Amino acid sequence: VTDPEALLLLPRLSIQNANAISSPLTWGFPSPGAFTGFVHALQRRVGISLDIELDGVGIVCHRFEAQISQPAGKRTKVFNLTRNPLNRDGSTAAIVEEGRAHLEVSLLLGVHGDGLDDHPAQEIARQVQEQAGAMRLAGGSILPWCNERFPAPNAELLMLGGSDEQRRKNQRRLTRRLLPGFALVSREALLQQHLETLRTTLPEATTLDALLDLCRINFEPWQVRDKPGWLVPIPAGYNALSPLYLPGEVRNARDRETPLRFVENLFGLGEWLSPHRVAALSDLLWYHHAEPDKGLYRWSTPRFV
């Protein structure tokens, strides 16, 4: 949640076969926890070598193409699966269901380290994209360019220094290259707002999101209930349901040197916005943050308002 010095831009990341289930309840665009864990994998691989801190991440999503189809007569939309290799006996394979969606996102970043003072600006942007080409974002591949070679280069804005005029004209240069998309933030306060509004009854927090994934055709005191934006359900994070184990006392772990808790998912609210709406683009970043004492493991866009 530290204020970023620079803003590294990954220009147009075409994503093949990303995940689209994203929670037990909210199908669609993949989880923002996938993006916050992606930047921590770049900080794992690159940011310790360039001595920089890659923490925040923005989500732009220029194009979303899911692999869905509605059947004949229904209105709900089912998923497209894939075959698997056969069994040991070669009879057939069991069916697991995995959502699948092509995707074209752009990723703002936040940089804190002293490598800005050592390496030049192009050296920062070159080492990241050459690493991020051979990686995976949402369980799917990342594709290169062909046949017009326009959107290939990166950008970087040292938004730590300069007068407020020098930021604001330079800030309008990123919003050019982020314009066909729709920026994504979390609105944790509107869900707190409408629970206190709906106190004629005694509802729940989960009963409010069903009144925000809505077409509430209201009868006249006919009419359709208005929306102040493109409000949408997102997974907010995780919530532990188990005590915190020793690293070597849970069977079939990934590795036997880190502790474990069994968690749930945790549902919140998100709004999709145009990039020219938001004044400061540093408010757009997603920061994972967690207190390990209790069971919270969440992520959000802080400082947004």
């Binding site: 017009e148 309008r172 050019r176 314009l179 066909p180 145009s274 020219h276 709406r277």
Partner: protein, 108 residues
């Protein structure tokens, strides 16, 4: 403020994936549309004209958009005597002021 940016969404989608944009198919009242939602082409294409090399103040299509925003509201006769349309004229004015400055750097 939605419509000020929805046109920008409409601008960039028409800008992207159309490099072969030109004026020759079907032009009757489409003035300065070659000037605002142009293909940048990494080059200029002009023979008997100098305007295509650069661009300054593409605001008349924004004024025509502002003339559409007066046409966007359908009919309200009781709003003229009240200062609500005067407030709406300020709503028309404070959003074009953001709209012109955004529209500069595509040609400035």
């Amino acid at each position: 403020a939605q419509i000020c940016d929805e046109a920008l969404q409409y601008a960039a989608r028409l800008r992207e994936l159309e490099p072969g944009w030109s004026a020759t198919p079907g032009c009757q009242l489409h003035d300065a549309e070659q000037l605002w939602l142009d293909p940048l082409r990494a080059q200029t294409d002009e023979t008997f004209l100098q305007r295509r090399l650069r661009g300054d103040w593409p605001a008349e299509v924004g004024n025509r958009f502002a003339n559409w925003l007066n046409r966007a509201v359908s009919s309200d006769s009781q709003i003229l005597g009240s200062p609500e349309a005067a407030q709406w004229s300020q709503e028309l004015s404070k959003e074009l002021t953001m709209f012109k400055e955004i529209l500069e750097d595509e040609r400035d």
